[PDB]
Amino acid sequence: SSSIPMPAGVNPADLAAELAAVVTESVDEDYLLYECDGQWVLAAGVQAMVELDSDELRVIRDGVTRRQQWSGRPGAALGEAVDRLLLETDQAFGWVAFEFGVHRYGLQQRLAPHTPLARVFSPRTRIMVSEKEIRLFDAGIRHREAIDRLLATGVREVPQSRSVDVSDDPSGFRRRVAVAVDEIAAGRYHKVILSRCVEVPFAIDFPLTYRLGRRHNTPVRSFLLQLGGIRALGYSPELVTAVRADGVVITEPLAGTRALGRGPAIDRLARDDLESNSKEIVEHAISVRSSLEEITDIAEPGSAAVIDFMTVRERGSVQHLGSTIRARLDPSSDRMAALEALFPAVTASGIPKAAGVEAIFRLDECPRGLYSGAVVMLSADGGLDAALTLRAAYQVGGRTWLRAGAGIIEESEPEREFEETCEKLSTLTPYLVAR
Numbered sequence: 001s002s003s004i005p006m007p008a009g010v011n012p013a014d015l016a017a018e019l020a021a022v023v024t025e026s027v028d029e030d031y032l033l034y035e036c037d038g039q040w041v042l043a044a045g046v047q048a049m050v051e052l053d054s055d056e057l058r059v060i061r062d063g064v065t066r067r068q069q070w071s072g073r074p075g076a077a078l079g080e081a082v083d084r085l086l087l088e089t090d091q092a093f094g095w096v097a098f099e100f101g102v103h104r105y106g107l108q109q110r111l112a113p114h115t116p117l118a119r120v121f122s123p124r125t126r127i128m129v130s131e132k133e134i135r136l137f138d139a140g141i142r143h144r145e146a147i148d149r150l151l152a153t154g155v156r157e158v159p160q161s162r163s164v165d166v167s168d169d170p171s172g173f174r175r176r177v178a179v180a181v182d183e184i185a186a187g188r189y190h191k192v193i194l195s196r197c198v199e200v201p202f203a204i205d206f207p208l209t210y211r212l213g214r215r216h217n218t219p220v221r222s223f224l225l226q227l228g229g230i231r232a233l234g235y236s237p238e239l240v241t242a243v244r245a246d247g248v249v250i251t252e253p254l255a256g257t258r259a260l261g262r263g264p265a266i267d268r269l270a271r272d273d274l275e276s277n278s279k280e281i282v283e284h285a286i287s288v289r290s291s292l293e294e295i296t297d298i299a300e301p302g303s304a305a306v307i308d309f310m311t312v313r314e315r316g317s318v319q320h321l322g323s324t325i326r327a328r329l330d331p332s333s334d335r336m337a338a339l340e341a342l343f344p345a346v347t348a349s350g351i352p353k354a355a356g357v358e359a360i361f362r363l364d365e366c367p368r369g370l371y372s373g374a375v376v377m378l379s380a381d382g383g384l385d386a387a388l389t390l391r392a393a394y395q396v397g398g399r400t401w402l403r404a405g406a407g408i409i410e411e412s413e414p415e416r417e418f419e420e421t422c423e424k425l426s427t428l429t430p431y432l433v434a435r
């Protein structure tokens with residue numbers, strides 16, 4: 001590993017994304033860029049790839065595909081394969097689908113053949129960009145040279161964005177919400193998150209879009225990727241699971257939503273409302289309790305604790321109530337078992353989870369794939385870092401779309417729920433840079 005000092009007026013987000021653009025273009029390779037605590041980690045090129053589907057597990061290295069059957073828990077199959085990748089290299093990266101979370105609630109039988117559950121790769125090279133420096137791990141001459149060329153020429157200026165109308169409802173989100181409300185009224189479950197896709201009728205430039213949206217979002221994690229034919233970027237508002245090498249596990253549920261970004265005077269009264277509002281507080285309290293019960297399934301007895309309770313978390317177009325829950329990983333458990341315990345996130349599924357996740361199969365467009373799943377970074381020393389995938393744009397084939405959803409409870413109204421998905425799309429819709 002060598003290192004280069006960070007140029008002076010240059011934001012590490014703009015640099016890391018420019019690198020992803022220019023460098024990975026020039027060599028025409030897949031990549032995933034992951035922002036985690038002031039480090040922008042660019043995992044460049046695919047040394048080897050684990051593909052976990054509902055009906056099969058594949059490992060692809062140097063043109064060769066090893067195919068395997070698998071049974072049991074998806075985290076056990078994924079875990080074994082990723083553990084092997086991590087004998088070779090210090091970190092692996094990828095994404096986990098919403099669908100990875102349904103086995104635990106008895107829904108494996110609903111997945112169609114070949115439903116993606118996870119894609120995790122080891123990179124050929126990593127470039128880490130922070131406030132202070134750029135570190136290079138296994139960069140070849142051809143990469144070092146292209147980085148040199150990028151530093152020489154400087155980051156492009158981001159052009160003006162092109163706008164999208166989100167106010168149509170082609171997938172019947174309003175009709176769907178009303179069905180959920182009826183089902184809640186008849187006692188079927190307490191809460192479900194439904195969503196809607198919005199088509200983007202032009203191709204976007206993913207790295208420049210990433211840069212622009214990043215100046216207006218304050219995420220816990222963020223990501224920009226091009227992998228196996230998917231392009232995606234997003235600003236993640238919450239950690240679904242982090243596991244540290246010392247066995248400490250964290251989850252960070254948010255529940256309760258006000259508008260933000262409307263100017264200081266408006267955003268203060270929305271905050272004060274938020275923090276003292278019976279409806280927001282009850283739903284936060286309920287999620288805290290569910291996620292504590294989930295974490296207790298993988299926790300050393302008595303180690304599960306709320307360490308930050310019900311405080312305001314600022315997230316760009318919205319502010320939320322957030323808590324942080326902590327535990328020690330039980331020696332009989334492992335990081336993948338921790339992720340399955342907390343997946344899908346409560347925040348983007350429902351309560352009780354078996355009934356809420358099942359309502360999503362009936363009342364949302366499925367599979368969800370990346371949306372409400374996680375983007376992940378895993379370490380040879382036993383680390384896992386899993387960001388909840390929301391506020392993301394995707395491109396697959398010739399289709400480019402956004403997706404956003406909202407929690408439906410007994411008192412919910414379709415019109416207001418639709419407006420909530422607008423506010424949520426707003427965290428990205430003003431910042432799309434056309435290709």
Ligand SMILES: C/C=C(\Oc1cccc(C(=O)O)c1O)C(=O)O
Binds near residue numbers: 254348390391404
């Ligand atoms: C992060 C916490 C919240 O945000 C969301 C919840 C469910 C879906 C979304 C979405 O953007 O689709 C969302 O931003 C919340 O509404 O409680």
